[PDB]
Design a protein around this ligand. Structure first.
Ligand SMILES: Nc1ncnc2c1ncn2[C@@H]1O[C@H](COP(=O)(O)OP(=O)(O)O)[C@@H](O)[C@H]1O
Lengths: 160, 182, 426, 131
């Protein structure tokens, strides 16, 4: 609650994180540089790092016509060939002098349909994490685990 | 528990139905079943065989109209199933027979098999939540508002008189002959 | 169909180049990451990851072991388990096996499972990456409406898990077209009238759907009003707090009952001459009698002196505490307290008495003191026991005259109580 | 194929067919499509009109799916796939067969129904093997 995290801090982590998840390693492309220099995106970084009512920001990897179209949109949406990658803040206060990467949560969203996409993410990593945690270490924990399995089953049937 | 009771007034000639609480029966049509007599030749003809309601009344020339109920007694249960099923169709009620208790009018001195098989039809093919078979005279006096008096009815297949005393329909004074409208 | 199962080289390079950006303030691959990748166990975990088609996830933990200031070592396992000093990570494959001649990252679903507790970890990922994403996907257009509701109530279930609600508070859903009508009136500021539907009011399918919604509402109310559990199940504070929860929860059900939207639906059914759902909304729902019994027990449940029994380690504090709690409980003469309920209540009181005395004997070191101090402690124990016996007989006579003033029957009421303190007294 | 495949695929199958045909008929009943037919009838090109009103199996398809719909509406087979408790599996079997009792008002093919029961048994053996 001491300062405001500038756009440039998470710009550096975006230009250094996008090549290893949206590209094939190396340098942040021209579309990513244009997207990071977007006035709209500048406002999105300001509202994501210095406004406690904005929990999300998404860095979409859109391809059209065989054309590269990167984007920074806080509202989450789906494109058929959009290999999205979002930044989710854990805490309502993100710092600049402190590491900006150890205060957020990064998450891809591939071009697959959200049925198998969210089934893969939630059903594959959420269940062992949550189950191994609560089966180690309150009241409605196993029934909410049951609800996790029910959501898992619903997405599984939506996929097949 | 269910939505609302559906009062299906039978009749050997004209069935009448609607939801309870309604002012007048919104759905009334003859109690007959018409199936075509001629030969389907040209394509694009009147699809479907059994017709009931306004469509059976409209194309009256093609049909071979028969009655499934005579003298307040059901003779064919298949046609009655189709008639009741037609009552629950999209042309009359647009509902389901699973969320509505059913009030069913029925003429006195009828065989037990009417109530028995009619109950099987409702609670099994229709699977209604609640069925209630009743007299007809008791209902007519309830409709007029007064309470003690005889009721002289003559529908399409039956005619009878019931001396009702405050609702207790005296079962030892119900004369009934089978000479009615039809 | 994959003939090119990805070599471990590209994956290790992907780990070294990407993983420290999430496990540091940018940085590079540390030497412990290289030794952690070259762990034979870690190599076979990543090989089982890239070879087995059924294996989807793997854990790349950031262990920060102390006094080496803390060290940075990495743990690799396919099993995902939460750490409290570590930034764990999850890699899910989009494919059963990776074809490395495309971006290997685009065949990996990197999900960051940091040191934030799994409750809020799942809450964060759901509320910020599943609900807007999947709900936007259904906005562009079935199992999906149920999936949608499971997303919402699953993440809310994590809140119910944390705060320990213990009572289901289910809202009453209304038909969407009525909400659009009230929305249209909300754009103006006008009160949404009953005859706004006009001809739509006295129609069959309309009133049919209205009664369907009200009928499900009655089942939602009855789902929690008639709810009951064993009075001795759980500790004393759990049962007492359970009655308190029921009180405030039934008031919340009254809150949902008194909203003008629900009343608008009731006005629809009344104006449409359908008295069934209207009269059953108050009679078929046992909310009225539940609220009156709740109000009968409402002052009895507020300001309960159980905390006087909580931090009481001295037997004198327990003496005065026991007398205080029972004198506050004396108001059950005017609120119809049941017999067996009061007896299980008494045994619950003795349960907590026994628990307090158990830790009291623990912090006493009684097996080493002299008979002077042990004699004083002994006499104090019997002081507490005698307060229990004589005041409990006063409560016995209290309930005796209560049953006399109520004049109900000649039940076989068991007063052969074997509480939780005679077990130590003998 | 009513023989193979999971039973859930069949339930979802008939529901999806009702959705498809429902949207199809709403596209057909639009005044624009109607006016195209009006134009062809005024132009007397009866090949198009008769073929549009009798060659498509739409009128029979809507009829057939609406005859199968009460059996297909809200089939509770997910409950077997929901809980690992053997008693829950039994209760799911009970609710499923009571829901299968609805065939008396559906005129669905009895042979397809038998194959559906075998698909249910595949789900049974699957769930039990899982548990
Ligand atoms: N204006 C009329 N004059 C004489 N008879 C009529 C007239 N209108 C109807 N009917 C006869 O009365 C019968 C209607 O009685 P109905 O409503 O069938 O009694 P229920 O329904 O109890 O059988 C019809 O069969 C018809 O033949």
């Amino acid at each position: 609650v001491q300062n405001v995290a500038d756009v440039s801090v998470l710009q550096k982590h975006l230009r250094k994180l996008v090549p290893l998840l949206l590209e094939d390693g190396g340098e942040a492309p021209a579309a990513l540089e244009a997207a990071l220099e977007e006035k709209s995106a500048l406002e999105q970084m300001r509202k994501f790092l210095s406004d406690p009512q904005v929990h999300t920001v998404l860095v979409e990897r859109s391809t059209l016509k065989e054309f590269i179209s990167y984007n920074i949109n806080i509202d989450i949406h789906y494109g058929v060939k959009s290999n999205s990658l979002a930044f989710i803040k854990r805490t309502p206060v993100i710092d600049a002098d402190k590491p900006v990467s150890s205060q957020l949560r990064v998450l891809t969203l591939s071009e697959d349909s959200p049925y198998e996409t969210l089934h893969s993410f939630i059903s594959n990593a959420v269940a062992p994490f949550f189950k191994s945690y609560i089966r180690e270490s309150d009241k409605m924990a196993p029934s909410v685990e049951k609800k996790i399995a029910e959501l898992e089953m619903g997405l599984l049937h939506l996929q097949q | 528990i269910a939505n609302q009771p559906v009062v299906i007034d039978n009749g050997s000639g004209v069935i009448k139905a609607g939801f309870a609480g309604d002012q007048i029966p919104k759905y009334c049509f003859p109690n007959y079943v018409g199936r075509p007599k001629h030969v389907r030749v040209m394509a694009g003809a009147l699809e479907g065989d059994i017709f009931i309601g306004p469509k059976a009344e409209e194309h009256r020339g093609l049909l071979s109209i028969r009655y499934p109920m005579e003298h307040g007694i059901v003779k064919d249960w298949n046609d009655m199933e189709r008639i009741w099923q037609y009552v629950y169709s999209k042309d009359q009620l647009q509902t389901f027979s699973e969320e509505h208790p059913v009030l069913l009018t029925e003429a006195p001195l009828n065989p037990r098999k009417n109530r028995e098989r009619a109950a099987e039809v409702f609670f099994e093919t229709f699977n209604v939540p609640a069925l209630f078979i009743s007299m007809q005279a008791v209902l007519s006096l309830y409709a007029t508002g007064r309470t003690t008096g005889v009721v002289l009815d003559s529908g399409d297949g039956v005619t009878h008189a019931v001396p009702i005393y405050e609702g207790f329909a005296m079962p030892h004074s119900i004369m009934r002959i089978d000479i009615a409208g039809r | 169909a994959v003939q090119n199962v990805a070599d471990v080289s590209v994956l290790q390079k992907h780990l070294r180049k990407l993983v420290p950006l999430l496990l540091e303030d940018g940085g590079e691959a540390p030497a412990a990451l290289e030794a952690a990748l070259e762990e034979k166990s870690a190599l076979e975990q990543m090989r089982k990851f890239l070879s087995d088609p059924q294996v989807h996830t793997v854990l790349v933990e950031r262990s920060t072991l102390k006094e080496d200031k803390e060290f940075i070592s990495y743990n690799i396992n396919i099993d995902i388990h939460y750490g409290v000093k570590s930034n764990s990570l999850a890699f899910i494959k989009r494919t059963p096996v990776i074809d490395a001649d495309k971006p290997v990252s685009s065949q990996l679903r990197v999900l960051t499972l940091s040191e934030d507790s799994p409750y809020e970890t799942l809450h964060s990922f759901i509320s910020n990456a599943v609900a807007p994403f999947f709900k936007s996907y259904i906005r562009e257009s079935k199992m999906a409406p149920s999936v949608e509701k499971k997303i919402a109530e699953l993440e809310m279930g994590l809140l119910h898990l944390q705060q320990n609600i213990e009572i289901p508070e289910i809202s009453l859903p209304i038909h969407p077209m009525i909400t659009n009508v009230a929305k249209q009136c909300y754009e103006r500021g006008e009160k949404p009238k009953v005859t706004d539907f006009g001809d739509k009011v006295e129609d069959p399918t309309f009133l049919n759907q209205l009664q369907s919604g009200v009928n499900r509402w009655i089942r939602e109310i009855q789902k929690v009003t008639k709810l009951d559990r064993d009075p001795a199940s759980g500790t004393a504070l759990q049962e007492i707090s359970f009655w308190l929860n029921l009180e405030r929860a039934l008031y919340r059900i009254q809150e949902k009952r008194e909203s003008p939207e629900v009343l608008l639906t009731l006005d629809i059914l009344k104006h449409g001459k359908r008295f069934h759902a209207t009269v059953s909304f108050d009679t078929d729902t046992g909310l009225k009698q539940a609220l009156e019994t709740v109000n009968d027990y409402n002052p009895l449940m507020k300001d309960f002196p159980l905390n006087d029994l909580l931090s009481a380690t001295e037997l004198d504090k327990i003496r005065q505490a026991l007398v205080a709690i029972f004198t506050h409980l004396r108001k059950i003469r005017n609120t119809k307290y049941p017999i067996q309920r009061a007896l299980r209540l008494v045994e619950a009181i003795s349960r907590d008495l026994s628990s307090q005395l158990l830790k009291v004997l623990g912090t006493r070191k009684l097996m080493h003191v002299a008979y002077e101090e042990f004699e004083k402690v002994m006499v104090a124990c019997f002081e507490v026991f005698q307060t229990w016996d004589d005041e409990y007989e006063k409560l016995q006579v209290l309930l005796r005259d209560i049953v006399k003033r109520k004049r109900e029957e000649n039940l076989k009421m068991v007063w052969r109580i074997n509480p939780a303190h005679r077990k130590l007294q003998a």
